[PDB]
């Protein structure tokens, strides 16, 4: 039982036990399935559902050559950085959206899924980088970051920090320090006359 008319299982994949750290954000190609974006948009499940370059009311009657689903986990404070032309630690060193971004940003609180009473220190974020990330770039290197003045010689220590730090996701956190799951849809439209699409 499998057909290209099967609806894309967004419900199942979104509900996964674990997501990727924002610094190594995971990217899927939605292919050979029917994506009904009204089922997401009209499910009151998601806190953030903001689209850019496209009206979300008319996602279902558009033609897409290529659809990308970028997924990761950040804190609720940082969800406002998942937008074009934003600044901060995430947008600059983890996940940058371009100014001409044509897609949708979907986010929802995942406290019950990603927070652990022991403390969940496995979701990471990048804290230092020589330059800001170009849009849709992904940096997973672990080179020892040089503060600015004195050399590091590839060894950690004073003014020489490991570029990745762990989030501290416990369920007693404030809403702003609680983990939020983010899914970012990237659209490629079909060059075609109005008469067809």
């Amino acid at each position, epitope marked *: 039982h499998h057909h290209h008319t099967n609806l894309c299982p967004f419900g199942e*994949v979104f509900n996964a036990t674990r*997501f990727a750290s924002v610094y190594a954000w995971n990217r899927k190609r939605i292919s050979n399935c029917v994506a009904d974006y009204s089922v997401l948009y009209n499910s009151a499940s998601f806190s953030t559902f903001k689209c850019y370059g496209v009206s979300p009311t008319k996602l279902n009657d558009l033609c897409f050559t290529n659809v990308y689903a970028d997924s990761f986990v950040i804190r609720g404070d940082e969800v406002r950085q998942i937008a074009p032309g934003q600044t901060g630690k995430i947008a600059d060193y983890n996940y940058k959206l371009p100014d001409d971004f044509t897609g949708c940003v979907i986010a929802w609180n995942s406290n019950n899924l990603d927070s*652990k009473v*022991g403390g969940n220190y496995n979701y*990471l974020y990048r804290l230092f980088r020589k330059s800001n990330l170009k849009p849709f770039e992904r940096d*997973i290197s672990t080179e020892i970051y040089q503060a600015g003045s004195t050399p590091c010689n590839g060894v950690e220590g004073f003014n020489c920090y490991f570029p990745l730090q762990s989030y501290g996701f416990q369920p007693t956190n404030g809403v702003g320090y609680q983990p939020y799951r983010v899914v970012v849809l990237s659209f490629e439209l079909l060059h075609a006359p109005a008469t067809v699409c």
Partner: antibody
Amino acid sequence: VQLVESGGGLVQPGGSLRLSCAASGFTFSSYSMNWVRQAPGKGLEWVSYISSSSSTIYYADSVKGRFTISRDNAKNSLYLQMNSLRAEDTAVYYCASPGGITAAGTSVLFGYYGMDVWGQGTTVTVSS
Amino acid sequence: DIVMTQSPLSLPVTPGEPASISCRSSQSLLHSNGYNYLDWYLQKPGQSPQLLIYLGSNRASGVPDRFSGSGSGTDFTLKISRVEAEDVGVYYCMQALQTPITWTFGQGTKVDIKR
């Protein structure tokens, strides 16, 4: 399912094969890995452990000097080389990921929260 | 080198009524930070093991209200307030105090539908 075992099958005693556990959907490099097997009828038995940075490795007494566990974070996969197989090694072999991270040189899981992700298991039958 | 002792071996349950499994350890599992390093797993028939309780008494993700872990030091217990049909399987407890050197499980507890 976010972990998928492969490579299991039929093998004659004294022989060898390698198992592979392929992660997808999360950052494989951030978690440690475990191999856990279940002999036919019997219960669960832990086999080996590899840290996130692949720097701290522990086996069990039953498989020492025979099994060697390894990981390749670039390929989001976990490996288990099973040499000098015996008939009692027949079992369904699971890969699972315990939560937590290792600090300094001493291997100890900080902020532990169990093996929240288990594979589907691959079956290994050792018989001549 | 810590010995887990589950009881009972088999446990019939009526859907809609409570149930209790016990796990006893040969040594205390209470660490000096105040956490009990003991997990509970469930292996539904023909299915992979599933995490139920971590750190002694805390439910894993997705686990319904019905399940709850308790106990401290050396005697721990699982408790299903309302057993339901799908809970049939084998329940293992696991000490985590000596991770990652040794990961010791219990014998398991097979669960039947009582009739």
